Amino acid sequence: GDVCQDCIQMVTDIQTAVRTNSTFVQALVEHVKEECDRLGPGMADICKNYISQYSEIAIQMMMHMQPKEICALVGFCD
Amino acid sequence: GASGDVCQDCIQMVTDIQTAVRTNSTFVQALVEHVKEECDRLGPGMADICKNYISQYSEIAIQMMMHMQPKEICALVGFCD
């Protein structure tokens, strides 16, 4: 679909950004951690530790598969 | 450069996702069914915890993403700005 093709385009350029931009992943992880602040006082911290331990497996898992597999896994393709 | 392409791809994809929710009656169903099936890779007690965390919070997720411009959504996930 349209959303499927857009997702493959996005994941392809994200893997390109991780390969070429050294600060892309750091800035992205810092931004998602900054969006954990919208939770409560105690529960923002577990959100940032959730990213702190699962960003690595997410980024490396993304870079070890093809983009159509990524979008098939997320749900925008097939 | 490479990250600006990611921002452009995000705007296009989120705009087409908003269109697909407004124009296809089965898009949201199939998407949340696939996300619930993807919870099964976790532990057997907590695959169901994952599934009903998706169930309790799919309504906020779809409706909040509906009442938002695609640029705000991409800025929130970090692919833009």
Swiss-Prot record, chain B:
Record's protein name: Saposin-B
All copies of domain Saposin B-type, residue ranges: 4-81
Site, Not glycosylated: residue positions: 24
Glycosylation sites: 24
Consequence the record notes for mutating residue 26 to I: In MLDSAPB; juvenile; affects glycosylation at N-24
Residues of the full protein shown: 195 to 272 of 524
Source lineage: Eukaryota, Metazoa, Chordata, Craniata, Vertebrata
Positions of disulphide bridges: 7-80, 10-74, 39-50
Effect of residue 49 to C: Strongly decreases stimulation of cerebroside sulfate hydrolysis
Highest taxon in the source lineage: Eukaryota
